[PDB]
């Protein structure tokens, strides 16, 4: 289907001794596929999938440079910021960027972002027109015009329209052993009694990818939504995901209820119930 | 000023005897600097990993921290986990039903 | 692959 690929960027500042703590993570679609940790020992930029380690050296000195620069910038965003907010060199402040872009299932050009957070608070971010900037407040206003000014949106839209598609292309072809795998949701259901009377039922998906999903309950084929549990979507450190929703029933009218699992790796959805 | 979600689980059903991987996700945080122990009957782990730090659309940060482990019958789980929005350490036990 | 490009400070 439609495809992604988006970058994670936090800078934490150290107010005690020394430089922002500096970490950035890459990913396609749902897969980490590069990471840099200036606490790490490299002070590289690192291969976390198998597809990325084909790169040659020329790539790998080219992402680590662009990364540092990143780094720096924000380094610098960090100071700036703490001026605007008329705030103490004593506490830590955190900057957060993520940008990408989209695909459809032609590969082409869907969607792009480039959107950026002080403290955990929408900052500045670009519009999706990839022209236009939504400043949060009075300070990201003098970043907008800062940004106007220097022609920024004009570069970013080049970027996130050609080269982070172009790219995203070809890494969907190196990694499409496993980029354009879906791995179904392996389902299950457990019963645990919560009295002599009354039971839980769980409905379990597991190994699924994307992380994309949807777990429903029905009694006798009607949405049901009372007394019932969704856990957020997790990770099983293998690259999979799991969820689960339960529902407590009184026993022995366990036929009724049916749990209903849509996934983008199943052509009809399942369902499963108890017996 | 947000404070952390944990879930607590393994990467497979559980079989007691069988070893497997005992998680801890946290996520909805902010800031970023975070305390997690995975705890074998009350104490620590030693050799436990995490997950490179992200973010989710509203800006809060997620981890997964991670140990080989074997269920049995004896042995109690947990991850506990420390972070400015909270007043005191929080303890969540691991059931292998969740 | 990064953007090569982000050097405008806030
Ligand atoms: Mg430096
Ligand atoms: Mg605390």
């Not at chain 1, 992604?4 to 890459?26: D, H, K, L, N």
């Not at chain 1, 605007?84 to 969607?111: I, K, P």
Request: net charge negative.
């Amino acid at each position: 289907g439609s495809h992604s690929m988006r970058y994670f960027f936090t800078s934490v500042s150290r107010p005690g001794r020394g430089e922002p703590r500096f970490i950035a993570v890459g990913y396609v679609d749902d897969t980490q596929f590069v990471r840099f940790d200036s606490d790490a020992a490299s002070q590289r930029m690192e291969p976390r999938a198998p597809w990325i380690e084909q790169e040659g050296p020329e790539y790998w000195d080219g992402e680590t440079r662009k990364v540092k620069a990143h780094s720096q910038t924000h380094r610098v965003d960090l100071g700036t910021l703490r001026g605007y907010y008329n705030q103490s060199e004593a506490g830590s402040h955190t900057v957060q960027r993520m940008y990408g872009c989209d695909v459809g299932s032609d590969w082409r050009f869907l969607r792009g972002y480039h959107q950026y957070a002080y403290d955990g608070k929408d900052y500045i971010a670009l519009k999706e027109d990839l022209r236009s900037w939504t400043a949060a407040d009075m300070a990201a206003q003098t970043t907008k015009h800062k940004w106007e000014a220097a022609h920024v949106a004009e570069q970013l839209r080049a970027y996130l329209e050609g080269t982070c598609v172009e790219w995203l292309r070809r890494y969907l072809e190196n990694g499409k052993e496993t980029l354009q795998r879906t791995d179904a949701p392996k389902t299950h259901m457990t019963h645990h009694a919560v009295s002599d009377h009354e039971a839980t039922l769980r409905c379990w998906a597991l190994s699924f990818y994307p992380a994309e999903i949807t777990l429903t309950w029905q009694r006798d084929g009607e949405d049901q939504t009372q007394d019932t549990e969704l856990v957020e979507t997790r990770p099983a450190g293998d690259g999979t995901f799991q969820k689960w929703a339960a529902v407590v029933v009184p026993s022995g009218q366990e036929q009724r209820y049916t749990c209903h699992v849509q996934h983008e790796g199943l052509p009809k959805p399942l369902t499963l119930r108890w017996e | 000023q947000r404070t952390p979600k944990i879930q607590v689980y393994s990467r497979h059903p559980a079989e007691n005897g069988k070893s497997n991987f005992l998680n801890c996700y946290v996520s909805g945080f902010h800031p970023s600097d975070i305390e997690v122990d995975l705890l074998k009957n009350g104490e620590r782990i030693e050799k436990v990993e995490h997950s490179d730090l992200s973010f989710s659309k509203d800006w809060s940060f997620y981890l997964l921290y991670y140990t080989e482990f074997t269920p049995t019958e004896k042995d109690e789980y947990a991850c506990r986990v420390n972070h400015v929005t909270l007043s005191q350490p929080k303890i969540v036990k691991w059931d292998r039903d969740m | 692959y990064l953007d090569s490009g982000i050097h405008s400070g806030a």
